[PDB]
Amino acid sequence: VTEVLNYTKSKYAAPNPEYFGKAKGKNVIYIHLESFQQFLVNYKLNGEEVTPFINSFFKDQNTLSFTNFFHQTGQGKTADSEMLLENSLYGLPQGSAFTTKGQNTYESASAILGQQGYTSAVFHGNYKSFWNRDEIYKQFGYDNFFDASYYDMNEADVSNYGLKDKPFFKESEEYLSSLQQPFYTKFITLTNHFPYPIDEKDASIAPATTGDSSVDTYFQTARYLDESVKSFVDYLKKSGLYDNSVIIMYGDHYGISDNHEEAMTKILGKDYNTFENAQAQRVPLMIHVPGVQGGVQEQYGGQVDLLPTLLHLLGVDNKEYLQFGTDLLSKDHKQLVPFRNGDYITPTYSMIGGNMYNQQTGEPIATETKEMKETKEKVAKELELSDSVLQGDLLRFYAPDGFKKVDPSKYNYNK
Ligand SMILES: [Mg+2]
Numbered sequence: 058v059t060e061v062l063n064y065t066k067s068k069y070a071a072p073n074p075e076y077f078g079k080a081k082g083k084n085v086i087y088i089h090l091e092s093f094q095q096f097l098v099n100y101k102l103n104g105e106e107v108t109p110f111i112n113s114f115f116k117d118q119n120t121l122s123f124t125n126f127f128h129q130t131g132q133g134k135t136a137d138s139e140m141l142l143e144n145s146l147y148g149l150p151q152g153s154a155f156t157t158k159g160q161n162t163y164e165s166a167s168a169i170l171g172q173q174g175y176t177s178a179v180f181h182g183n184y185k186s187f188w189n190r191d192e193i194y195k196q197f198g199y200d201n202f203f204d205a206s207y208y209d210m211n212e213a214d215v216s217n218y219g220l221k222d223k224p225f226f227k228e229s230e231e232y233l234s235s236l237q238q239p240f241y242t243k244f245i246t247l248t249n250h251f252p253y254p255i256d257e258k259d260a261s262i263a264p265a266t267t268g269d270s271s272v273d274t275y276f277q278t279a280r281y282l283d284e285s286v287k288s289f290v291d292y293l294k295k296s297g298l299y300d301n302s303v304i305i306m307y308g309d310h311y312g313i314s315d316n317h318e319e320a321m322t323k324i325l326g327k328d329y330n331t332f333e334n335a336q337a338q339r340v341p342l343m344i345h346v347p348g349v350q351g352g353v354q355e356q357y358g359g360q361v362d363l364l365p366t367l368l369h370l371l372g373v374d375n376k377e378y379l380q381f382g383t384d385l386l387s388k389d390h391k392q393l394v395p396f397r398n399g400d401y402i403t404p405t406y407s408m409i410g411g412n413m414y415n416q417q418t419g420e421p422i423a424t425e426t427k428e429m430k431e432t433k434e435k436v437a438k439e440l441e442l443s444d445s446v447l448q449g450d451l452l453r454f455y456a457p458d459g460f461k462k463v464d465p466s467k468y469n470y471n472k
Pocket of ligand 1: 134135309310
């Protein structure tokens with residue numbers, strides 16, 4: 058109740074002077090890389106790079122790239138990722154939080170940044186009823202929701218899950234250019250979605266040769282996404298948004314489940330056991346902050362840490378908000394990444410499937426020490442306190458002093 062707030066502050070990580078406020082006043086552009094796993098980065102299928110542009114964006118001067126960034130989603134899949142990004146809250150242990158907690162009071166990024174005059178918007182090539190986004194986005198405080206109704210949904214431009222990504226970015230330039238700055242936006246892509254079907258040739262790369270169809274055509278839809286993103290970034294550079302915004306590319310969750318051990322063994326080269334599968338849960342995080350020296354960031358982290366990381370870059374102190382994540386650029390950030398099912402990843406030891414593993418060598422640890430038991434309970438506590446917020450709707454009874462709550466009745470996403 059006030060218990061959650063006490064845990065939050067004690068966990069709070071002070072801003073890093075080198076990165077604090079360096080992007081204050083800038084726009085924010087989230088690029089949602091659907092089902093995009095980190096191992097795809099710099100991966101070469103039969104000689105050539107699978108995702109060439111993203112690989113270059115990864116190496117760029119002004120790009121903070123994360124190699125130990127893990128997704129913390131559950132049965133909510135993509136919805137849970139949004140929950141982690143917007144509120145720094147975990148999803149439910151079971152089922153989707155978006156569907157059952159659409160009535161809850163939230164104090165999300167749209168609301169927090171809205172306090173400074175930011176304009177909110179979400180772009181998605183599918184209808185707003187999907188994942189109950191239409192309802193819960195109002196509680197988040199998203200000013201605009203550009204769903205499928207704002208796009209040309211002809212049969213040739215539409216896959217199984219909605220509008221293809223290349224038309225999606227192309228057609229959304231109209232809306233983004235006329236959106237009041239400064240803004241806070243997120244572009245949810247669709248094409249790279251299981252079982253990853255692509256008809257030739259939207260595709261521009263040969264499929265893998267493992268014998269597993271869903272795994273083989275994954276690399277094809279990944280490049281289709283890569284090509285469309287490049288086209289979108291090219292637009293951002295022409296319109297000047299590229300220098301005036303913070304571009305953040307991230308993955309929401311895994312792309313290949315653990316029911317493809319044989320194929321994944323050929324892909325990664327090593328045996329795809331339970332350990333290597335947990336390591337495969339890495340998803341990309343690339344933060345392009347204009348006029349800031351970037352580089353590879355190997356500190357361990359999760360999606361829960363994304364919002365407080367962004368806030369510190371924008372020069373916004375979030376000490377008083379109910380957020381379970383910490384600033385990734387902070388030196389006080391502790392490298393501990395909880396999974397939804399109770400598991401966790403630390404640089405030294407990791408619990409996977411309830412069993413202990415050496416994170417660095419992959420070899421099982423027979424006996425469990427105190428510190429391995431201690432962090433196990435720290436993780437369970439964090440997950441429980443997060444559920445306490447969702448299950449009890451605790452944000453009705455709390456808010457930071459200067460903060461103003463959202464009136465969801467004042468939002469309409471229809472045209
Ligand atoms: Mg997804």
